[PDB]
Amino acid sequence: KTAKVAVSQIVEHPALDATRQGLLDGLKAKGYEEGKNLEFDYKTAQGNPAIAVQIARQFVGENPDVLVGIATPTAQALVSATKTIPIVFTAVTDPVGAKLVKQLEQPGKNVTGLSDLSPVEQHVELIKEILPNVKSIGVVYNPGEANAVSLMELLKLSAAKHGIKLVEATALKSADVQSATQAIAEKSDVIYALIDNTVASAIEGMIVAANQAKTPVFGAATSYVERGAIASLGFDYYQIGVQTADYVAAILEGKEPGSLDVQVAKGSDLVINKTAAEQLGITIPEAVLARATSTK
Amino acid sequence: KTAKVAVSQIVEHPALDATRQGLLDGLKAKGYEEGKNLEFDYKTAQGNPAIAVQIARQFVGENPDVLVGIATPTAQALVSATKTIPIVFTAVTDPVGAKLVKQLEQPGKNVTGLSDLSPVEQHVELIKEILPNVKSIGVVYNPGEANAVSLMELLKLSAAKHGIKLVEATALKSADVQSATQAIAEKSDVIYALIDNTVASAIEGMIVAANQAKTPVFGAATSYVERGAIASLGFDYYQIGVQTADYVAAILEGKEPGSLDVQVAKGSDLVINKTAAEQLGITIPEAVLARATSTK
Ligand SMILES: N[C@@H](Cc1ccccc1)C(=O)O
Ligand SMILES: N[C@@H](Cc1ccccc1)C(=O)O
Ligand SMILES: [Zn+2]
Ligand SMILES: [Zn+2]
Ligand SMILES: [Zn+2]
Ligand SMILES: [Zn+2]
Ligand SMILES: [Zn+2]
């Protein structure tokens, strides 16, 4: 009679924390309240792929009604640890590429949820609009994250389509992100800070290195503009969490997760960091400043 | 390796919520953190003695490392539901009278914790100091709460010692507290709002009735002065929660709960509500206003 929802999250960074808060508030609006009829357990893997596996195993052994995997690596560990307990993943960039589901329509097993697939093409076109003389896009990513790998395939096709050279470096853990940024910032006209958990957890260090090379950072997430990216075009992760509660409630009420289609997030907010831009000697064009849903 | 602490609370009122927050923060300072190595589950009985029993049974069936009973009725249900899982009670007025322990020194079974036994004698002497012409003390209490019963025995001895008549009414649930207050407020020079969960959860209604009879309320808890009691001499429930974490951590580290002495809270803060007092046409004496650790 108490619903038991167990939430595993690869690391605490603001986007994933907003997703988790959104889930909690959305469950409340559906009549599931902590303290009354909802036990909401939560573990962070602290960026460790190993802890992600241990969390999945511990949670599976406590027989929750629904498992929630926030971000790709923790979702992946859940899919490995159970084939029968419903899994709702959330804020996962490319669930097919991550092997969480065979396809988005009618996934058909114990797994379903929500994708935050970035519109990479739109981000490149936006970088070109803000910075019309871009020849070069720098990017740091973690090849251990299937989300980053899927995004790099989209970025490589879109860079080539627009005649833009990609300058790449990998970072295997968040403490290498600043060095990786430093290695590439002077060969790049702009750094694309993508939807990668390792980047997200070290975004301050990325920005310190970029600022030192006087290279702007364009963010795929709003949390990045908050820390000094000049602009971003990201989703609202709190609302994605709120929509995640729809899946969890439907499952708790007896729906099979495999019968629920995977939803892809839509509508990103254009945000501009005027201060950061001016410190870099950058003038954000008028047509862009006019569309800015927000403007710090 | 994850500590599992399950917390049962009779009802959400501010004192018990502060105790619970204190417990959580104290566990953090001891190295037990939610999301990492601490699963902290929480249920409120919503004032229902029956739900208290159901919570105890559900929690016992989930094999937590330590059960925490905040307030007497939920502690009592835990003691009934398990004889072997460690129970740490907290904010319990009189654990011997409540049958949680045989005695405070070396309780010797699966139960230990912290008492918030009110210094009733000191409260009467304080009521007489603030209001030197008191002949009559009104009190509303719930005879289903062993804490209230223990406190009434102390109040009856102290009223008689000081030549003060007690005017009493019972309230079986919080929705009767306002009517009970109304029934007695005109025969009372002051209402003593005691350490009772039913009173605490209906303190606004008590104060509405008292204010209507132009009768002051003296509070045994600071949360009561916040809502319009003229004065209070209560414990700091956040710190009691912090000290509760000492017991929980010691148990988690292999101490037997029965080998831990029950601690009695000490040091109450004198707080005065000047606004409320003046609306009642009351002048709080100088010697008292001088000792007031706080003064809204
Ligand atoms: N979409 C990412 C999570 C993420 C969200 C927001 C910013 C950065 C990372 C994943 O698939 O794991
Ligand atoms: N001491 C009370 C709890 C309580 C604390 C503070 C105010 C009112 C009630 C009990 O034994 O249940
Ligand atoms: Zn550069
Ligand atoms: Zn469909
Ligand atoms: Zn739990
Ligand atoms: Zn009166
Ligand atoms: Zn002793």
Q: Annotate A59-112 with DSSP letters as a single string.
A: HHHT--SEEEEESHHHHHHHHHH-SSS-EEEEEES-TTTTTS-S-SSS--SSEE
End-to-end CA distance of chain B: 46
Q: How far is it, in rounded angstroms, from Cα A224 to Cα A148?
A: 16
Which technique? X-ray
Residues 6+ apart with CB under 8 A from B71: B9, B10, B11, B16, B91, B92, B147, B197
A12, A35, A58: residue with CB nearest B2: A58
Report the distance separating Cα B143 and Cα B130, nearest Å. 28
Residue closest to B285 by CA, chosen among B213, B231, B217, B209: B231
Residue B35 to residue A43, Cβ atoms within 8 A: yes
Which ligand neighbours the alpha carbon of B136 most closely? 6
Q: What share of chain A is helix, strand, coil (3-state, %, to 5)?
A: 45, 20, 35
| Dihedral, CA of residue B184, residue B186, residue B190 and residue B192, to nearest 10 | 10
User: Degrees (nearest 5) of the Cα angle B21, B24, B27?
Assistant: 145
Length of chain B: 296
Tokens, residue A39: 């036990």
Residue intervals in chain B for CATH 3.40.50.2300: 1-117+235-267, 118-234+268-296
A-chain residues near B44 (CB < 8 A): 35-36
- Paired tokens of B237: 């429930």
Residue A72 CB partners (closer than 8 Å, separation 6+) = A10, A89, A92, A93, A98, A100, A145, A146, A147, A197
CA distance B107 to A154: 66
Is the CB of residue B127 less than 8 Å from the CB of residue B134? yes
> What gap in Å lies between CA B256 and CA B259, rounded to an integer?
5
Beta bridge partners of B70: B9, B90
Token pair of B254, please?
């292999």
Taking CA atoms, what residue in A is nearest to B61? A62
Which residue has tokens 């309320």? B217
Q: At what angle are helices A120-130 and A146-161 packed, to 10 degrees?
A: 50
Quote the ligand 7 centre to B95 CA distance (angstroms).
Answer: 16
Ligand 2 neighbourhood includes B229 CB (under 6 angstroms): no
Three-state DSSP state, A244: helix
Provide the residue type at A169 as one letter.
Answer: A
Residue A200 near ligand 1, beta carbon < 6 Å: yes
Lookup: tokens for A81:
């640890």
User: Does residue B43 contact residue B68 with C-beta atoms inside 8 Å?
Assistant: no
B262 touches B112 (CB < 8 A): yes
Residue in B116, B109, B181 with CA at minimum distance from that of residue B142: B181
- Please return the burial class of B52, using the count of CB atoms within 10 Å of its CB with bins 0-12, 13-18 and 19+: buried
Alpha-carbon distance of A233 to B217, in angstroms, equals: 57
Q: Which ligand is nearest to the CA of A103?
A: 4
Q: What letter would DSSP give residue A5?
A: E
Q: Which of B201, B215, B200, B137 is nearest to B169 (CA)?
A: B137
In this structure, is the dihedral angle defined by the CA atoms of residues A23, A27, A28 and A29, taken in order, positive or negative? positive
Could you tell me if B290 and B272 are in contact, meaning their C-beta atoms sit under 8 angstroms apart? Answer: no
Is residue B175 a contact partner of residue B123, using CB atoms and an 8 Å limit? no
Distance between CA A66 and CA A101 in Å, rounded? Answer: 17
Query: Do the Cβ atoms of A35 and B41 come within 8 Å?
Result: no
User: What is the greatest pairwise CA distance in chain B?
Assistant: 61
Q: What gap in Å lies between CA A248 and CA A5, rounded to an integer?
A: 8
SS3 content of chain B, % helix, strand, coil (to 5): 45, 20, 35
> What is the rounded CA–CA span in Å between residue A72 and residue A118?
14
Other beta carbons less than 10 A from residue A162's beta carbon: 14
d(CA B27, CA B39): 11
Mapping DSSP onto H, E and C, the string for B35-92 reads ECCEEEEEEECCCCHHHHHHHHHHHHHCCCCEEEEECHHHHHHHHHHCCCCCEEEEEE
Structure tokens at B43: 């249920």
Token pair of B42 as six digits: 């929480």
Q: At what angle do helices A177-185 and A203-212 cross, to 10 degrees?
A: 30
Residue A125 contacts B where some CB pair is shorter than 8 Å: no
Which residue among B35, B41, B44 sits closest to A44, beta carbon to beta carbon?
Answer: B35
Q: Which CATH architecture has domain A118-234+268-296?
A: 3-Layer(aba) Sandwich (3.40)
Specify which residues B141 forms β-bridges with: B170
Nearest-angstrom CA–CA distance, B138 and A184 = 77
Q: Which residues of A touch B41 (CB under 8 A)?
A: 39, 41
Q: How far is the CA of A40 from the centre of ligand 5 (A)?
A: 7
Between CA B217 and CA B191 the distance in angstroms is 5
What element of type H or E holds A136? strand A136-141
Residue B131 token pair: 């209001």
Check CB contact of A226 with chain B, cutoff 8 Å: no
Contact A221, A234 (CB under 8 A): yes
Amino acid at B226: E
A1-117+235-267 domain in CATH 3.40.50.2300? Answer: yes
Residues of A comprising the binding site for Zn(2+)? 39, 41, 105, 185, 188, 215, 261
**Cβ <8 Å between A44 and B58:** no
- Beta-carbon neighbours within 5 Å of ion ligand 5: A 39, 41; B 39, 41
What is the CA angle B138-B142-B148, rounded to 5?
A: 80
Q: Inform me whether the C-beta atom of residue A65 falls under 8 Å from chain B C-beta atoms.
A: no
Distance of CA B180 to the CA centre of its chain: 20
Task: Give dist(CA B65, CA B32) in Å, integer.
Answer: 13
